Motif scaffolding. Structure first.
Motif, mmCIF file in Angstrom:
data_model
loop_
_atom_site.group_PDB
_atom_site.id
_atom_site.type_symbol
_atom_site.label_atom_id
_atom_site.label_comp_id
_atom_site.label_asym_id
_atom_site.label_seq_id
_atom_site.Cartn_x
_atom_site.Cartn_y
_atom_site.Cartn_z
ATOM 1 N N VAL A 96 0.636 -1.222 0.040
ATOM 2 C CA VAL A 96 0.328 -0.063 -0.037
ATOM 3 C C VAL A 96 1.096 1.302 -0.250
ATOM 4 O O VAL A 96 1.602 1.142 1.056
ATOM 5 C CB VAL A 96 -0.872 0.052 1.116
ATOM 6 C CG1 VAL A 96 -2.258 1.523 0.960
ATOM 7 C CG2 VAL A 96 -1.315 -1.123 1.501
ATOM 8 N N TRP A 97 0.840 1.917 -0.953
ATOM 9 C CA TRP A 97 1.211 3.706 -0.881
ATOM 10 C C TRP A 97 0.329 4.810 -1.059
ATOM 11 O O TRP A 97 -0.576 4.959 -1.406
ATOM 12 C CB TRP A 97 2.184 3.311 -2.526
ATOM 13 C CG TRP A 97 2.532 2.575 -2.722
ATOM 14 C CD1 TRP A 97 3.358 1.474 -2.963
ATOM 15 C CD2 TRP A 97 4.480 3.063 -3.238
ATOM 16 N NE1 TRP A 97 4.336 0.604 -3.345
ATOM 17 C CE2 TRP A 97 4.970 1.711 -3.663
ATOM 18 C CE3 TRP A 97 5.243 4.304 -2.939
ATOM 19 C CZ2 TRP A 97 6.485 2.050 -3.479
ATOM 20 C CZ3 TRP A 97 6.334 4.650 -3.079
ATOM 21 C CH2 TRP A 97 6.863 3.177 -3.184
ATOM 22 N N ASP A 98 0.452 5.212 0.199
ATOM 23 C CA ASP A 98 -0.968 6.209 0.967
ATOM 24 C C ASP A 98 0.106 7.599 0.706
ATOM 25 O O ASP A 98 1.239 7.790 1.240
ATOM 26 C CB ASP A 98 -0.408 5.885 2.709
ATOM 27 C CG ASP A 98 -1.347 7.417 3.041
ATOM 28 O OD1 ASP A 98 -2.342 7.472 2.383
ATOM 29 O OD2 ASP A 98 -1.184 7.193 4.712
ATOM 30 N N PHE A 99 -0.503 8.150 -0.341
ATOM 31 C CA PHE A 99 0.247 9.911 -1.371
ATOM 32 C C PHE A 99 -0.375 10.955 0.058
ATOM 33 O O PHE A 99 -1.843 10.951 0.586
ATOM 34 C CB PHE A 99 0.037 9.831 -2.491
ATOM 35 C CG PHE A 99 0.837 9.158 -2.807
ATOM 36 C CD1 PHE A 99 0.654 7.509 -3.259
ATOM 37 C CD2 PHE A 99 2.089 9.142 -3.362
ATOM 38 C CE1 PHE A 99 1.027 6.824 -3.807
ATOM 39 C CE2 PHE A 99 2.767 7.931 -4.681
ATOM 40 C CZ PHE A 99 2.534 7.518 -4.471
ATOM 41 N N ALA A 100 0.385 11.727 0.723
ATOM 42 C CA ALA A 100 -0.031 12.936 1.036
ATOM 43 C C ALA A 100 -1.174 13.770 0.084
ATOM 44 O O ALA A 100 -2.325 13.996 0.824
ATOM 45 C CB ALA A 100 0.704 13.990 2.099
ATOM 46 N N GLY A 101 -0.480 13.879 -0.521
ATOM 47 C CA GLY A 101 -1.106 14.616 -1.584
ATOM 48 C C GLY A 101 -0.125 14.670 -3.074
ATOM 49 O O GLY A 101 0.261 14.222 -3.481
#
Ligand SMILES: Nc1nc2c(ncn2[C@@H]2O[C@H](COP(=O)(O)OP(=O)(O)O)[C@@H](O)[C@H]2O)c(=O)[nH]1
Ligand SMILES: Nc1nc2c(ncn2[C@@H]2O[C@H](COP(=O)(O)OP(=O)(O)O)[C@@H](O)[C@H]2O)c(=O)[nH]1
Ligand SMILES: [Mg+2]
Ligand SMILES: [Mg+2]
Lengths: 174, 172
Positions: A51-56
Motif C-alpha cells: 500500500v502506497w499512501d500519498f499525502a497529496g
C-alpha cells in the motif's frame, strides 16, 4: 526535489547510517506498508497488498518515473565486517542502478568499520579500486567511505559532506 | 500488487487505511525528507527526499513497470466539503490515467458522518454524471461513502471491494 536512494542488502546498516547522518509536514508524504489479507474462498492464498499512501498531489507527482530514475543519487551500503564478498555483492546493485539511469551517481559506504579486521578493510579497498571504480557499464562511483554507522566521527562527517556536494553538483555530467 | 491511495491532504486517506487494515522486521521502503542547512558552495536550504530500501526485492518493486502497471487506486475525498470535492477528483483521475493507463479506481467519499443528505445526493449525481465510464478517465469500478474512523457495514463492503478488485485485476 532530489532523491537519495539508500540501497544494499538487509542488515547492512542502511537505516542506522541514515539515522546517524540525519543526527516539515504534519504527516509523512509517502507511507508504504504491507497489508496481508486472508481470503474467504480457499484454493487461492492471496498475496499481500503493498500500500502506497500519498499525502497529496505533490507527493504523487514526485514518483513520476522521470524523477524516480533521473533525479536520484544513490548510497550503496555494505557490511565491511563480512569481508570482500560484500563488495562482490555490490555488483548486482550497481548493474541494477545503471539500468535505471546511465548517469546515476553512486556513493559507496562500508559500514561496521568498528568490528572489521584490517585485512577485511584492505581487501575491500583493493576490490573496489580493481573491480568497481570507473568501469564502463557501472554507474559513476563518485566516492567511497568506511564508517562505524552507529556514532559520529570525522569519517561520517566527510560522508555527509560528500552527499551534500554530489546533490549540489548533480546538475552536472562527470 | 500495489494499492495506491491518492487524494488531497486532510481527506482521510491515512485514517481510512488504518481502519481498512483493522512479515519483515523492518519497513520495506521508508521515505522521509532530510533538510540540510548548507554552507558548501553557498548557503540555502537543501532538502533531500530519502528512500531507505530494505533490500533487493523492495528496490525491484519500484521499477517503473510496477509503479505504473500493477496498481489499483483508491481516490479519496471529503464528502462533507460538498460536490466541489468530487470536482477535485477530476485532476486526480487525469493524473492516474496518464500514469497507469489500465489501472482501476475505487472512489471513496469519507466524512459520511458529518455530511448531510444534500451533499451526498449532489456528490453521487456528479459521480454518475461526470466521472463514471468516461473515455480519458480510468475505469471507476466502484464508489463508496464511509465514516473512515470506525468499523461499519459500509466500510466492510469497501474492504471486500478492494480485495475482490485486486484479485480480479491480476486475472484480467
Ligand atoms: N557495530 C556496528 N553495528 C552496525 C553498524 N551499522 C549497522 N549496524 C548494526 O547492524 C544491524 C542492522 O542495522 P540496520 O540499520 O537495521 O540495517 P538495514 O537492514 O540495512 O537497514 C543493527 O544491529 C545495527 O545496529 C556499524 O557501523 N557498526
Ligand atoms: N468525522 C470524520 N473525520 C475523518 C474521517 N476520515 C478522516 N477523518 C479525519 O480527517 C482528518 C484527516 O485525516 P487523515 O487520515 O490524516 O487525512 P490524509 O491527510 O488524507 O491522510 C483526521 O482528523 C481524521 O480523524 C471521517 O470519515 N469522519
Ligand atoms: Mg533498514
Ligand atoms: Mg495521511
Amino acid at each position: 526535489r532530489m532523491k537519495l536512494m539508500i540501497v544494499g542488502n538487509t542488515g547492512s546498516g542502511k537505516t542506522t547510517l541514515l539515522q546517524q547522518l540525519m543526527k516539515q509536514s504534519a504527516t509523512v508524504g509517502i507511507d508504504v506498508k504491507d497489508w496481508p489479507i486472508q481470503i474467504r474462498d480457499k484454493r487461492k492464498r492471496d498475496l499481500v497488498l503493498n500500500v502506497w499512501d500519498f499525502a497529496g498531489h505533490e507527493e504523487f507527482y514526485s514518483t513520476h518515473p522521470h524523477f524516480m530514475t533521473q533525479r536520484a543519487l544513490y548510497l550503496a551500503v555494505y557490511d565491511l565486517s563480512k569481508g570482500q564478498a560484500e563488495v562482490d555483492a555490490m555488483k548486482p546493485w550497481l548493474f541494477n542502478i545503471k539500468a535505471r539511469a546511465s548517469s546515476s551517481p553512486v556513493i559507496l559506504v562500508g559500514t561496521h568499520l568498528d568490528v572489521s579486521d584490517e585485512a577485511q578493510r584492505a581487501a575491500c579497498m583493493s576490490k573496489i579500486t580493481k573491480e568497481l571504480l570507473n568501469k564502463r557499464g557501472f554507474p559513476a562511483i563518485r566516492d567511497y567511505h568506511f564508517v562505524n554507522a552507529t556514532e559520529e566521527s570525522d569519517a561520517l562527517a566527510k560522508l555527509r559532506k560528500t552527499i551534500i556536494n554530489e546533490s549540489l553538483n548533480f546538475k552536472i555530467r562527470d
